[PDB]
Amino acid sequence: DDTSSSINFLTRVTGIGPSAARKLVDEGIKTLEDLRKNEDKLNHHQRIGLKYFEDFEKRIPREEMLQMQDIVLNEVKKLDPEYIATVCGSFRRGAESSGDMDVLLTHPNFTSESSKQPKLLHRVVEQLQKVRFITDTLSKGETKFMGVCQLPSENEYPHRRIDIRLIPKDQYYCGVLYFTGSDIFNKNMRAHALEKGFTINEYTIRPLGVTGVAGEPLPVDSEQDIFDYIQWRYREPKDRSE
Ligand SMILES: [Ca+2]
């Protein structure tokens, strides 16, 4: 009922899961104003969320995405040029608006062999708060920063979720493809390759075989590379709606 109305609302707040949101109901926490008077009940995640309830619903215009992506990209150049940073999502695919900045990052330095270089992402984030670009954190791994950026005002913009993800360079491509999407594109891509005698995921591109159980990743220098394995004309990210 109109109470369920609640679990439905709360869940609107980031960090608030269903079971998570469920408890806030038992304690008698319902509206956001209920939230507000109870940060003490919230971990840091749910807290940033309520912070930016508003902003967190507006969408991201592309003019803005661009600006944001220039800043991210430039800084990363400064630290170490060997560093690669692709912005993914709808955005990469010409989308006119979007819901957040999704970044994929890698360094020749780190590969699926390494598996331990949080400083590599971290260095990346700091430069960013150093810049006043990132402005809050949501959570933060040794490989996946989750947070909240903000375009520089001249005088202001909304707060905006951003995610950085460290992926091995041997698995970056597959990874870039994946996060590019779109959903069905991925469905279709994987779909054909399976015909051409290959299996794919965000990590790799591997041959199939007898009984089907098989593998052993193939080399991937580019996104183009993957497409050649499957023998398709490389599809620009635009023509990827499916
Ligand atoms: Ca996202």
From Swiss-Prot:
Residues at which Mg(2+) 1 binds: D100, D102
Annotated positions binding a 2'-deoxyribonucleoside 5'-triphosphate: R59, S90, R93, G99, D100
Binding site for K(+) 2: T11, V13, I16
Cofactor binding note: Binds 2 magnesium ions per subunit.
Annotated effect of mutating M101T: 50% loss of activity
Region: DNA-binding, residue numbers: 93-102
Changes after translation: Methylation by PRMT6 stimulates the polymerase activity by enhancing DNA binding and processivity. Monoubiquitinated protein is then the target of STUB1/CHIP, which catalyzes polyubiquitination from monoubiquitin, leading to degradation by the proteasome. USP47 mediates the deubiquitination of monoubiquitinated protein, preventing polyubiquitination by STUB1/CHIP and its subsequent degradation.
Single GO cellular component term: cytoplasm
Binding annotation for Na(+) 2: T11, V13, I16
Subcellular location: Nucleus; Cytoplasm
Documented EC number(s): 2.7.7.7, 4.2.99.-, 4.2.99.18
Keyword terms of this UniProt record: Acetylation, Cytoplasm, DNA damage, DNA repair, DNA replication, DNA synthesis, DNA-binding, DNA-directed DNA polymerase, Isopeptide bond, Lyase, Magnesium, Metal-binding, Methylation, Nucleotidyltransferase, Nucleus, Potassium, Sodium, Transferase, Ubl conjugation
Any GO molecular function: 5'-deoxyribose-5-phosphate lyase activity
Membrane-spanning ranges: none
PTM annotation (Omega-N-methylarginine): residues: R62
Family: Belongs to the DNA polymerase type-X family.
Assembly, per entry: Monomer. Binds single-stranded DNA (ssDNA). Interacts with APEX1, LIG1, LIG3, FEN1, PCNA and XRCC1. Interacts with HUWE1/ARF-BP1, STUB1/CHIP and USP47. Interacts with FAM168A.
Domain remarks: Residues 239-252 form a flexible loop which appears to affect the polymerase fidelity.
Protein name in UniProt: DNA polymerase beta
Lineage: Eukaryota, Metazoa, Chordata, Craniata, Vertebrata
Gene: Polb
